[PDB]
Amino acid sequence: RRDWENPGVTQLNRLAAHPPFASWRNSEEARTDRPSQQLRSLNGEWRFAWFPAPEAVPESWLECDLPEADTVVVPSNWQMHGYDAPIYTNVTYPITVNPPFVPTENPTGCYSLTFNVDESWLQEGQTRIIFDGVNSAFHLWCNGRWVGYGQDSRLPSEFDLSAFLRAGENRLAVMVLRWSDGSYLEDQDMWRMSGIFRDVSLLHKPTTQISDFHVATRFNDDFSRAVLEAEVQMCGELRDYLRVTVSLWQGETQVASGTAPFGGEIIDERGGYADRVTLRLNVENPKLWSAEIPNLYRAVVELHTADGTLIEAEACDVGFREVRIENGLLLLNGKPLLIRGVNRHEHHPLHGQVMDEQTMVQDILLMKQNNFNAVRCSHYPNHPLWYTLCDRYGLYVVDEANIETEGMVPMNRLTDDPRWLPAMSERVTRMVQRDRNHPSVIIWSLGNESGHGANHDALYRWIKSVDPSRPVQYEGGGADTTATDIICPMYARVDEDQPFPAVPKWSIKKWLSLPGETRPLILCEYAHAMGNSLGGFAKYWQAFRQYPRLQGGFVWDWVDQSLIKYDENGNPWSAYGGDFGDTPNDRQFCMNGLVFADRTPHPALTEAKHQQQFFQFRLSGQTIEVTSEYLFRHSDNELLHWMVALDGKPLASGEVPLDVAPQGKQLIELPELPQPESAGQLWLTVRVVQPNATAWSEAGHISAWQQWRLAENLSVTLPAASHAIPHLTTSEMDFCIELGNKRWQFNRQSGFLSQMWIGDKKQLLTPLRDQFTRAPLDNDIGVSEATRIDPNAWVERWKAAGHYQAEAALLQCTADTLADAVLITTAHAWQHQGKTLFISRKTYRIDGSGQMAITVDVEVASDTPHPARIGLNCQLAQVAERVNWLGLGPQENYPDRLTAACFDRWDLPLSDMYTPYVFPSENGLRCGTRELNYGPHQWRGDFQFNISRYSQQQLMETSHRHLLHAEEGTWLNIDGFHMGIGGDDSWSPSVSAEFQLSAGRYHYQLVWCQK
Amino acid sequence: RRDWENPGVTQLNRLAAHPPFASWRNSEEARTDRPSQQLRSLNGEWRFAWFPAPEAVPESWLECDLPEADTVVVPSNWQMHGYDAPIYTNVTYPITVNPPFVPTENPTGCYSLTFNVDESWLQEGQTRIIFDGVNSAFHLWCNGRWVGYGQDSRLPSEFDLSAFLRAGENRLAVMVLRWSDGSYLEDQDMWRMSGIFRDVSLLHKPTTQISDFHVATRFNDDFSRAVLEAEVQMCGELRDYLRVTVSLWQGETQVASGTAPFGGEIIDERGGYADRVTLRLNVENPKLWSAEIPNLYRAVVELHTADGTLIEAEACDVGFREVRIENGLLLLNGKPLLIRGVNRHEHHPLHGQVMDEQTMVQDILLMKQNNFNAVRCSHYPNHPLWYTLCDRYGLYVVDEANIETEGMVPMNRLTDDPRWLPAMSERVTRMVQRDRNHPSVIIWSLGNESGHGANHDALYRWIKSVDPSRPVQYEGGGADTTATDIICPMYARVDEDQPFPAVPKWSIKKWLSLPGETRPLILCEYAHAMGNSLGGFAKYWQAFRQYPRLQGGFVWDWVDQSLIKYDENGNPWSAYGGDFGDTPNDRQFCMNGLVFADRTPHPALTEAKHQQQFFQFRLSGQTIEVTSEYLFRHSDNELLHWMVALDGKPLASGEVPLDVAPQGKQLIELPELPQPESAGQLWLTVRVVQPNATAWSEAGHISAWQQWRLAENLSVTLPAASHAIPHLTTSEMDFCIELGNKRWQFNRQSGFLSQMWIGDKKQLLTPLRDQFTRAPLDNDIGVSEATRIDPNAWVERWKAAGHYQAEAALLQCTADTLADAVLITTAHAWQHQGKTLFISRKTYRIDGSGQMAITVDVEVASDTPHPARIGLNCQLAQVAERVNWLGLGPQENYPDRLTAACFDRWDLPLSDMYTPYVFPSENGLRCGTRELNYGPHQWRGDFQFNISRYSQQQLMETSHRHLLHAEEGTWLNIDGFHMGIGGDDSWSPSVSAEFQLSAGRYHYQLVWCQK
Ligand SMILES: [Mg+2]
Ligand SMILES: [Mg+2]
Ligand SMILES: [Mg+2]
Ligand SMILES: [Mg+2]
Ligand code: NA
Ligand code: NA
Ligand code: NA
Ligand code: NA
Ligand code: NA
Ligand code: NA
Ligand code: NA
Ligand code: NA
């Protein structure tokens, strides 16, 4: 038969899809959502055996346990047990593209389970087994008898076992095929794994039972009244005495209830559905559901007899909310949304694709804490609990069909093919059928990167037709096809067009206004967060706020898909593509998240938090204007704290409770701000604090902040008559400067400050030298590969230009004595294959105070690519415990990614100054720094810096953070200017022009001194 | 695996659908559409054995012939060979409704063929088998090896036998299931048969080949320039040297040609289709296709190498025409269509569902000859040649998916069920893929009577997406759902609404203007031509012509679905529902056509012919205004013949050439018309004659006619005075009147004219009495049945009122004497259970001239159902050869069905005065009769009459025409008034009110005399 190589066969004997069931035989348990005795989990310990192909499976296995099998926990991915390697491939299918066939060599997992079944279950009713997720296809046998077959790794597959079970001990046999015709529709950019990775359970239902139920909530013009309409379908024998009661609960209070016998209205010439009924309940002043306030009711549906005897009850949470597109805007409860979203794959660094509640809750909490209000299920239906959580914690969800065929050529090879219409349609219809009652689901998605074919148009219409309550979106074929209600591109930039043929990515601002275009625009994917990224994130938010039809996006993406590996010592490390022997592979491309696989944040997450704030502020005078971006709630859990500080020193602060209506404003007058005695810049900072803990945050959570510079007083104060004069000692090879117990030495042939002593202690491990490059970020690299260079990537342009191989040539090195000081002058040219790339001119002034003033004037040839940076660097001899600076922080920040950072006095352990991206690179920079303190040293000026135990050299040479090792001393990189990091996408140059070091001539100055 | 009881499996190993291929290896042949050596017929003699269930078939059969098998012709329907009975059921499924299962006793036809295959076929390329039509499902084996499976009885199932054949003799084995899950989608109203009922063929294709091609023709604003676009797809090895050449020919002249290598434009991010290519050819001044003038070009598609070697050629007929709906109208080449359509099932009285080219041609010619320009493929895709003929002869076609699930409850039960989307999808997509290059197809239909389900919306969209060139219609769920571009009701009436719940049938005039409605309206079915029907046909035509958005309709239907049976003496007779022992069944409902199963016309065909005329005329004075309803051609094969006749006495005629541009007028002045010889009504008749023969008509064909009354000179002439005086003889029992050779005998107890003599010859077999009833037509009976009376049917109403059992009561009978005559006066009451239904009052005046003048005044109780007729009747003793009359004719005509008839003197064999409707009823009436002659008799007046060898009693007691027996003498029915026959539908009263005998009081006068 070979069912797994035939798209016309997606399953056999599989029962129809439906909303979550539990078959309660008690209404109150249904109501309270408590555990049902009729729903049993079969998770736990199973028997497993791996085969290289299904043909290698012994027939004996059907009847009894193979001795060689092992005992593993289910759910699980077999790759996570070490049976075979998971594979990380992004676009390229992991198998030869020759649809619908698969390799003969097809890893087959043989699972089995011995278990008991009570006769009461068998004596009456129906017993079905449910597989929440099986990757990628499987055959099912029960007690040596074949039951059925199923495809679609992301939706449950259920089979009736009533006639196969016996009272007592029973044996289940499951054969899971790693590859199948289903794989052709599962080309998502993630680890390719396999097995029974989601829940397995048994459900007992009565013969006469509820087989499906739909809940709808329609509203009046101002949402002050609603009608809850509940359509109920049954299976089993119909009887006049049967009844259906649907009741609606607001907590313990019974809001409404209606009852009726089966038998719907006349549908057509042949009549109506005798086996369905629709109950309609009026609700006055419903408490509306939103991500701001996730008000929910409980709908209980009871199938019972006229005498009042319950047969069974099913139920669901209900959120009263209306989703609609009108006049080009996506409205929720009549208000236009602003999606602060994120795409989130189901990934566990240890369990692979197996999802648990803990994990899910932790994700949600972090999301909420970080001002995210929506998530897109990239790119398949999620584990069922996920929707229950979003419902309850409150997140807007885009539910997406498990359809991705990006590896086809062209992209819509399958989707435009009618022979693939059925398989595809099952991926769409079964999703809708299972998830349609969830209020957190506000938009349906037809899948991802599958081109645009006629199958998508058909499915788009099917959906609109069965569930008019939610818009339908799809990005394939150019982001604005006839199969999408929303213009939902991936990586379209804010102002910059990327006119690819056939599927150009217009600037989002321009897209909205193309001739005849009227739909809302919400990026299904944007701001690719791979490595040190999210450069230019603010640019998106400023546009979203400015343009009404620009309604947000889903950042790509939530968490890094790194897996855990263990070294010889049994120490764990983060592995990516290729690390399991998987090949071909896509290396680090599986790590694009805002958090690390273990949920620790990347620094970009804080930039996201800030841009996504729900309160905007404006300062005028002593007047702060706060404006609420909430659409439904009042700021009833917020207070504004403010503080004024002069150069980090706090002068005043206070607090005012916030009282702002959704969309409203509040003016706050600050109190008389006494002057201040000392030159310096006064800075005002405000933060919004939630005095109370919520279901997703603790008392004291800071939900937003802002800063402004206030008065500044320039120091006009002339220093003081230096106690002594520095002495210059000139030799053939060095200019030596002595002052107190301090010495500086300048090598006359190199032209660099080669050594500095404090007492008889050398302070440097390497001379202080100009530096123009950085260990390349993911964004600098893009797709470039040693074996296949992308000459357009930044990294490649810099290498070729000789930037990383350039050699300093001394053009001049003089020393002069001034009245109270010693002055050294240097000039150096950096050349490559006869071309002058850069010229650096410096002055060093050492005065009687022992401060060393460095002035740097740099020239950059116009025709060379813009450099990654323009600074100096050195390896200090010293290693100190803390880093203290007065600048932007506390976390890592870059030119195009520094809005969330605040100007203050920060102090941290040196380790917090290094960001452990899995794929090492330039990291840990802090910009806008006026003062830096490390050990006895102090540097002052206006610069950006990074300090760590790793040289740029080591970083650029190391592929996994676990292989890095602390060098001797501390590497200090101090930049007059640094290039932005970009992140619009990570496969093409994405650093905005205003962030490129293209001025041609650069000036910076710094004072090094001892503290 | 029981594939036939799973809608999830509709085929196994079947090849993709595609336009007709022939794989010519010679271009000139492809060009002239000559036979191809690569396309061979397997039709002819096969081996066949019948089994009661698939489980009864022996395995031996796979390997060798069953000795018991018979040798039969293929294609055929096995029921047609007497192996089992064909079943005639209309809506109710012939099997228990329990999807997707079917009965265990499932008639199985085991067919086989041993045939030869030449090595040349096998040395290279691909050899596939093609089954054009297998009802309902089948498994296929070749040389004992299983090949695949197929469903959908109306489309070709193709399999690659390449790996299964050997040079020389080969053996196929086909197991055909009568019932399958596919049967659930095949509930059309027609006989339920089975077998390999369409051609079987074998096609050889090279390995590198043309796998599909779509032809599109697009035009400039005025249709003076077109672009022919041909998208070509290949399978097999791509090489740079491959090319596609597409050439377009008009007859023997090459219009254009173009070549390119494969490689289509970039479609998306992954690129384009390397295996496709689109050639675009400019056509200046194309000759446009239409049903008025079916100009065709030939497109030839060559696959070959750049060095010029041909690999293979395919081709098709191309008709340049655009179909579009705009501003509410369906336009063809920019002009609004007026559809003169008919529904046509594939039926042969002998061959059952096997269609041959002779039969098809015959159908087409008759249709064309009767002013039809369009056909609907009710309700499934037709035999391929049908389209080719429609292309070439010129008829607009509606191609419809083989989806009808009427017997479900409610009707959309399967169509709204996503589990059935797949099965449905293949029925729609495979049709389009096969029929999309035929110009004759102007509209696609999603099927028939399957309610309205979400599957419909999806498919509707799919088609819109894949072939934008033609509108999509579908009547289900109410005729105006979102799954149709055209309001296409079935049996909606002209002025009368039928406001059924959920799916009302509004008057079509009212339908167009419902709030918000703007679509065009074309009835998918109207004017149910069952038996003596088509009453009110002209009312649709008047509406069609007056209202622009009323674009016509498809009459139901073309031919009766009667089957031939043989009597004990081998004499053939027309059978219908229940005649094969089939039960349950729908009796005569399978006979609704304009023509008998043998193609002989029923009388209503002429009605349709006249109403559907392409020329409209008006008369003013001596001036005839001819208007053309052609949209495209000038009247270039037309001349007008006119004639003026006085009381059928010709006075003058002439002929004028017609020269009318489409939609234009022509004014023709008739010549001075001399004054006429005497009293009477002059009548003008004009006729459009085509002097030259056409592909579909003979020289001399009359395509249109019309009449007008001209001057009438009333007779003021007082006749010469009887040179005699009738003698009366009063007896207790009788009043006798004598005059020469004649004698009249009037029964004094009955009050009726009981006998008449001429010489010694008695004139009557039964007395002359009033008649108020008719042998009920199909429309009078509707769905009423003995076992399930339908009290609203006119027949029931009459029966229930006692109309058929009413007995005459003599109220009065007197003989009076005048100077010149004898006057007999009578009066009778017809009653039923004390109710006086009708009162008849008359006078008979016999005078010196031998004429018997009869005067009748009838009263009808206001509260009794309106009687079928009001007249007299008698069985004449004579049986004469001819029937001559001055009235409407010559064909049978009724009040609501007489517009096509013409007033003139007619003379037919008495046998032509009987209409052999298979289900016997009142028939043969001729209206507006002023004089009737038969045998020695003459009757004059103004009436309607019928004359035959069958009494009404007999017609009304006989079920099949073949059982009628001529009675002694000749039955005469002379009516003053007669009820219309109706026909809007045949299951509810459909006689319009102006055609009901509701006046309460009626008067009529007849003169009887000797010819
Ligand atoms: Mg399959
Ligand atoms: Mg992808
Ligand atoms: Mg099937
Ligand atoms: Mg029907
Ligand atoms: Na916006
Ligand atoms: Na990725
Ligand atoms: Na507050
Ligand atoms: Na690195
Ligand atoms: Na019209
Ligand atoms: Na019928
Ligand atoms: Na003419
Ligand atoms: Na009859």
UniProtKB/Swiss-Prot annotation, chains A, B:
Induction: By allolactose.
Names of the cofactor(s): Mg(2+); Mn(2+); Na(+)
Active-site residues, record numbering mapped to chain: 449 (proton donor), 525 (nucleophile)
Keywords attached to this entry: Glycosidase, Hydrolase, Magnesium, Manganese, Metal-binding, Sodium
UniProt effect for mutating residue 782 to A: It forces the apoenzyme to adopt the closed rather than the open conformation. Reduces the binding affinity
EC category: hydrolase
SUPFAM superfamilies per record: (Trans)glycosidases (SSF51445), beta-Galactosidase/glucuronidase domain (SSF49303), Galactose mutarotase-like (SSF74650), Galactose-binding domain-like (SSF49785)
Positions contributing to Mg(2+) 1 binding: 404, 406, 449
Free-text remark on how the cofactor is bound: Binds 2 magnesium ions per monomer. Can also use manganese.
A Pfam family recorded for this sequence: Glyco_hydro_2_C
UniProt similarity note: Belongs to the glycosyl hydrolase 2 family.
GO CC terms in record: beta-galactosidase complex
Protein name: Beta-galactosidase
Single GO term (MF): identical protein binding
Positions bearing the site annotation: Transition state stabilizer: 345, 379
Signal sequence residues: none
